[PDB]
Symmetry: C5
Subunit: 271 residues, 5 copies
């Protein structure tokens, strides 16, 4: 899996803490994923290319830099070997939500003499923690969409690809390649990961984003077993499309933000 | 019941797992229902025909491909009483269900088909009136008919309240039906009958209006318990499990201003156990 | 006496009576429905009001009967329990739980009949705006308090409204006490359940006001309201009579002309009763 | 001293007093109501404000009395418990629970009287926009903190507003402490419950601001607010006085002319009290 | 150093210190933070300068008085160790916090300054993008910088991410700061750092959009518990308690159509206990 770097010089692991009261040592990993909104030039990191509109389904050829893609990373863990790292809990929030209080830069005035238009409209907030790559199912608004070089989209789509077509199974195995609009986490798989997403659609939808270091998601299933890290690898996945930025011209760009992860792991004996 | 296929080549059962630690054997059935929004041509699977408007109640003849219909399927289960003696009935009991709508991110395509929100703007998101509904039962879902307009003339290929009257716009107890055909019972004509469905659990939210935002959640960590107050889930009569859905996500608005319903498939993971019952 | 929707005879709105008897603490379930009373301006528009007037000065406000939604109510007769008991023993039916939902919420997905196009080439306008959803289960008729938008409103023949209203009738006037003793007569806009009484009933209501309010309605056979108070006592059925009350104004229907009508739906009730010893 | 809505005598807004006493731990329930104080611009428009002015410069902002909704409050007198007790024994009434709802929420379904048509041939405009729903139960008067949109506002005779306001009065100015000691005098726009005080009361408020905000109002006789703190102690009625406070601005009524008036409704209270032994 | 809003001396924003006492004495500290919205002149305390619009990302130079900043204060606490022998460390531990925004009803003034909503109408309520945030810690709040536009040129009197790059619009780990100065860290530049703040609890909700209604609750019955999973609250390491807030309520629209941020103060009641710790 070719994800965002989680070792070496550009590593997005900010801290590793070990809590050891003699038995059942907990390892906490603090890391982040950057959004992959399309980045139309070197200065507009975290934005998409301006959106096209009204393309007939027969001639729908979106530009690469217009398509937000899923973020993912493989975090390498110490080799234990059968003892496996088990993901127990995750704290996660979107980083930089207050940046949207800048109404002076770039955004269309709401009216004569007014401030800039806030980022608003369709948003998607999603994260996953797994012991293997996230498993995706493809579903398309329009099966005839012609997707650009550098994206991975449902192969040999049909009209059924607009509903459920079981041919479209993929691993989230490349960062910044699987367009959010083409793929969802596969509810029929991901037996070894936990995923969470909310889509809110509409022109005037307000973004609502919460931050707190007091909220924890438990990753243990009903049997008290968390995701188990195959090949000593921990997989984090995100999509955080916050809404649409409206320029003075009236053009619209997706805006995305990074997601923080604190994952608590323990060593677990397994068959 | 003539539903979406759940055996053979086109079966919409994706996986059957059996968890057997000697005693409490659980069978998990993973399946999906496709939406039945009307499918106006071979390319627009999951959409309706464009919506007509302002038909007088006296001349209201909606086209078949304009009407979303309920989805349903019969899942066949192993026979349990094949190797048992008289007086012993083992039945499959639906204990829990995990369900979510499949492909909710597809609505982040604002480049294809949808009217610009304003000059130089992106496409209009799918929005407006939506209905999200699912049912798990040991027999076909039981429906009650209610009509906006009793005089509506419904097209060939649909099953709608027979001999409607003005009372059919409120409660008319004549309009009882089994959801016994997939893609035939128009969502606008039928609701789950609260007076029946003693052997199923159903769940539905209608949200009406022009600008209603769709709000859809996905997670493999949420489970609905199907057991009643006595700890009994739906019991599968004739070794048949029934899943039913309607997932009208909202209205798609074309450049022209024409509007089509957009629907998505629903996933089901149903946990079943064997239960001893009298006779 | 209470002159409600019929709950015995040929036109009875009791759909089923089940008795669950495992030797002790027999439960009787009553399944019934109330139809909405939105005004029914002609024989074809059952469940709708007359079109809404606007801008009447408070000094000349004379709304038409068929424009005013009214509260629904019914007396359900129960078996006599004291026919076969000796003196000093009073057995009463006690309402323990209620399952209730609005019947036919999907009927609002008909956007082809009657409703004004949302824009050129568009579908019909969904029902939306001000709504009120209310139900009560009691052992006696529901007790009402009158409050008026405008005390000078002149209410039509066939309605019962606050007698001798004053400016204080626009806030709290304690003269305006009434029993919900007639179906389709007490205008919703004039009356609320009296929080100062109803010691022997449970009531529940949500008002949502505004032009563009989206309707949100849930259906499920898995949700139960417990009617027991802190002491574990439900409503007690005086004179062996169970009282159900409802108002389900779903929002406003907008015609092609731009005229608006209230749309209402029926409400289902499943009430669990047990026999209780009382002094 | 608190000059509130009448809660004894001929005009008393106590509707019922029920006593439940099974020999021990007697509960007294007090049922009462507060009327809204929206401004009442003439004798016929009880429950409404004067039409709203707009665009007054901060330097010349002189709102009319009948344009300002005010807090409602009342002192309910309770029996003395200490008349036949000896020195060193103090019994006080303790507020344990409250059931409260807004009275007359369905009155807003009158779209035929007074309200501007929503469009040609349409019904009247529903009441909507900025609303405030607030209630308090206490063993002493409600304690208020003043905060002003505009400190230079000149408030009319008949109102009590922050004395000698400053620019800091638009944020937190600790000079602006008051008791809610007069019904229909403390303008809602000038005052909030003081979170730094009210140790002997429980208060609850939601403000929702905006042009198109829908009113959402619930009624049920099955919902109870527990007034007990973490130690299981409710407000103590220290001079045998129970204090109820409310503000229920439901939104704006729009006339045919386009003028806007606040519309308010009364609030019902059922308060359960018990007798509690307290130290001298 | 933390140069915050005064919490000792004549201008102290500590309103009360209560002690509840035989063994586990609780000290309650009641204080407030004022908002720092920019205060464009001596009369407009709690407001920002009118907002500019449409600055190209390459020429974005916002004025100081246009930028809301985070509020913070260091509250000094009694020394506990003055009469203890070495190897014994008593520290103040923050257990709970009650907090609300002060003066939410001030937004019911629709007569002063605000543009009429329409001819003959009242003033436009404050509405749009808002941010409500508070923190309680035993050390200064730790911030991460993120920018809408990395090329923004921030005015003298602010502290903003040093040497920003395109990555500063997403996650750039160079932008670490302590909230060490009141009215200097612009809200739009900084968030609490989830990678740090091991010794504080923070809570924030951003709601963006033109027409967002402000929703604000007040009650003295709601408490936030600050204890972690081990039952340990923030520990005030140098006998210093840190409170931080940002309460941008929305936009005020003048008659001209110009817009200003409006902010309000936040109250804090913090319950502290003495806790024995290792040196
Ligand atoms: Ca009573």
């Amino acid at each position: 899996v070719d994800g965002q770097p989680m070792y070496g010089m550009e590593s997005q692991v900010e801290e590793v803490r070990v809590f050891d009261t003699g038995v059942d040592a907990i390892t906490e990993v603090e890391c982040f994923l950057n959004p992959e909104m399309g980045d139309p030039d070197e200065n507009l990191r975290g934005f998409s290319l301006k959106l096209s509109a009204e393309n007939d389904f027969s001639s729908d050829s979106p530009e690469r830099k217009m398509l937000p893609c899923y973020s993912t990373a493989r975090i390498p863990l110490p080799n234990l070997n059968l003892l496996m790292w088990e993901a127990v809990t995750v704290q996660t929030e979107v980083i930089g939500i207050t940046s949207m209080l800048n109404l002076h830069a770039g955004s269309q005035k709401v009216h004569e003499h007014g401030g800039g238009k806030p980022i608003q409209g369709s948003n998607f907030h999603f994260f996953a923690v797994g012991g293997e790559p996230l498993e995706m199912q493809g579903v398309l608004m329009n099966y005839r969409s012609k997707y650009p070089d550098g994206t991975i989209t449902p192969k040999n789509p049909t009209a059924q690809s607009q509903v459920m077509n079981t041919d479209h199974k993929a691993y989230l195995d490349k960062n910044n390649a699987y367009p959010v609009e083409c793929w969802v986490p596969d509810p029929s798989r991901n037996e070894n990961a936990r995923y969470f997403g909310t889509f809110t659609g509409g022109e005037n939808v307000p973004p609502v984003l919460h931050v707190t270091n007091t909220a924890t998601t438990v990753l243990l299933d009903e049997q008290g077993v968390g995701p188990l890290c195959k090949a000593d690898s921990l997989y984090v996945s995100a999509a955080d499309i916050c809404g649409l930025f409206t320029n003075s011209s009236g053009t619209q760009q997706w805006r995305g933000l990074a997601r923080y992860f604190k994952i608590r792991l323990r060593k677990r004996s397994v068959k």
